[PDB]
Symmetry: C2
Subunit: 419 residues, 2 copies
């Protein structure tokens, strides 16, 4: 056998199919989880400055991060977390949030360790756990009671304390928390975070917290970082993404924040994998954060203006999608919302697909080809045994240009005529 | 323990210490393996174009590579290798040559596998083998016996056919070939590559070939790619680095080329680690290769001009270092040359240092503090059992500005005439 056993069961990449199909039809692409408009001017200018400035920025920088970037991350997130952060010992710059996650799993997860993952989960958590020899253990958010004709809210998908507690064992190494959650758009409450924190402390478990959508919060909901809770800094790794912060997903710069006794192991993985991150994008991200720190909580800041603008896009999409009978679940954060397609499953059950194929995957293919709209089937964010049960949601991304939302409405109006 | 056992024995990073000591003294830094002058204008301009062009270049590109980049890599290297290369199946863009190496080890090396490593080796090959559960197996190039009438050549460092053959077993998974070699600067001959090819075919072993210094060849010596030899494409992974190609080490873009039946496993690692490489640097690299393809073999091409310029730098450094009794080994390629310090070990045997600290490490510290010149001790490129024997070489980098070479000569003047 040529390949390593660590690759068992993790070769299938659903994203390649999704991207391929969308490219082959006339569509409004609401499946792409990135903006189709420019990043803010200050961010693009920052990168332009980095590639036209000091010529030595074309050469290697320091292994654990470009010092101006680790300095501003430590200062800014130190303030946000109520934590003294040492840029040398508590910050690691990585190749995006993906690279940060990978670094954490490869540092901490070992053969036989259990890792608690919360469904619906960003799909890589499962195969990253597996490649590190871990055993994924799933806890499932419970969709709230659908009442009195109103739309569901992500806030009401519950993390049951008894279910969660039952998942912790002596083999648990880590719990992966993603808030705001992709795909659901749930913003975890202080009470929910206190529940997770209490169990992590009880069982001596590390919390890997993926906070890439930190700034994308709506309706007055506040992002709370679990590392800011009492006793949690010493057992938490906090992950962010410049791409999701500054609407520049192609920059692929991320970071991990955490205490030295954990971070030293991530540094070991880093120096034995990529060694350096690119210099100039790090300089761009540092300049961008400096801009936002100076304007923090002011009306002209991107972190104030941008979520307000995207909240309007969310509301537009929520209203529009109902015109064809899709039932949105209102998100409190992230780039995304999901819609229940149960009415379609009930009335239109017989879509072509493979024998075991979840309805949502079949429905998305039908929607792309026939209605000209792309979404992502939510079953990809579930463990395989649960996919047959959570097969009736699809994920839309509303972080789109005005023109794209208008184009969406053109497709929806056509669909409504033939309902 | 908290951390995964895959990290055992790979946490010590010599480079962090090297940077530290140099930063504390007034030095000419010939330890840094990167240019201290700008990349060529066309390369810097290409990056400027990528960050000021199509705004959608700020967002994600395709998982396995920015298509214009994979297209030109497949075209350009397909012609050099005498191989039809499909961009989608045979090319993977990675986070530098480092990331490419890491991806290869994680795809192919498993618990118990052996990996043959040729000393002196780029230092990461050993811990990357270890982190993947492999057992490193070392074969040493044997230094040419030198007559002090004329300087040794890296070409005289021999790969003994019997010694190499004896390293192969049923457990050998891969052999790592680095040519041109860092730190020695050896450019492997056709005969040497035919020896490696014969054994890899006989034993059904994969050759991981690190060709980052491909363009840095001197004195009429030709880079030969082992994947071009009969029957080798089907068992070789060929690695390159944009940083080493365009003198832009901080760009951190690299690639692997190989047959689909091996590459599919590298894609599995990639999609479960970083998922995307940054978009804009990939675009810059593609444009830079387009420029060099158009000017292939022409006087104005970087691949013609740059190695000629650096050969002059090499010759300057070879002459200069002899003034103080260092004995250079003339390299045929790479950024580097090594000097034998055996005369210093003879005359000055008792340098301060830790227990069992190899002489070369002690000598470099002495030279930094007293003479203001940085080199890298070559013992870091040897397995621990062999460091006792190979303790009398240090590595210099001659890919430096003319002002830096002038500053080197000032230090050498002081060394000779002062104190
Ligand atoms: Na425990
Ligand atoms: Na064999």
């Amino acid at each position: 056998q040529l390949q390593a056993r660590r690759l068992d069961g993790i070769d299938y990449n659903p994203w390649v199919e999704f991207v391929k199909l969308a490219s082959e039809h006339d569509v409004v692409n609401l499946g792409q989880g990135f903006p189709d408009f420019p990043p803010p001017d200050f961010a693009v200018e920052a990168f332009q400055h980095a590639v036209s400035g000091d010529f030595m920025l074309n050469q290697y920088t320091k292994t654990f991060g470009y010092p101006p970037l680790t300095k501003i991350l430590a200062s800014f997130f130190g303030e946000l977390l109520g934590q003294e952060i040492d840029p040398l010992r508590n910050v690691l710059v990585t190749v995006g949030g993906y690279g940060a996650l990978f670094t954490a799993f490869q540092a901490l997860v070992d053969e036989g360790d259990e890792v608690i993952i919360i469904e619906p989960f960003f799909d890589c958590y499962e195969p990253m756990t597996m490649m590190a020899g871990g055993r994924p253990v799933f806890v499932s958010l419970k969709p709230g009671p659908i009442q009195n004709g109103e739309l569901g809210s992500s806030s009401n998908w519950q993390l049951d304390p008894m279910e969660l507690a039952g998942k912790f064992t002596s083999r648990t190494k880590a719990l992966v928390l993603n808030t705001p959650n992709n795909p659901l758009g749930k913003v975890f409450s202080r009470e929910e975070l206190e529940l997770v924190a209490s169990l992590c402390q009880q069982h001596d478990v590390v919390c890997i917290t993926d906070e890439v959508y930190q700034w994308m919060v709506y309706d007055g909901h506040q992002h709370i970082s679990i590392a800011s809770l009492p006793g949690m800094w010493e057992r938490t790794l906090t992950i962010g993404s410049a791409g999701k912060t500054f609407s520049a997903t192609g920059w692929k710069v991320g970071w991990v924040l955490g205490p030295d006794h954990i971070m030293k192991h991530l540094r070991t993985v880093h120096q034995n994998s990529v060694f350096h991150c690119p210099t100039q994008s790090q300089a761009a991200v540092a300049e961008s954060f400096e801009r936002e720190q100076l304007l923090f909580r002011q009306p002209s800041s991107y972190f104030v203006q941008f979520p307000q603008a995207m909240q309007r896009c969310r509301d537009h999409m929520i209203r529009s999608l109902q015109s064809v009978g899709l039932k949105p679940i209102i998100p409190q954060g992230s780039y995304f919302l999901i819609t229940d397609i149960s009415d379609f499953k009930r009335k239109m059950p017989d879509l072509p697909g493979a024998v075991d194929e979840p309805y949502d995957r079949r429905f998305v293919k039908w929607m792309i080809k026939n209605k000209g709209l792309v979404a992502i089937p939510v079953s990809i964010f579930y463990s395989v045994p649960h996919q047959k049960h959570f097969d009736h949601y699809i994920r839309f991304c509303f972080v789109k240009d005005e023109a794209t939302l208008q184009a969406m409405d053109e497709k929806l109006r056509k669909w409504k005529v033939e309902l």
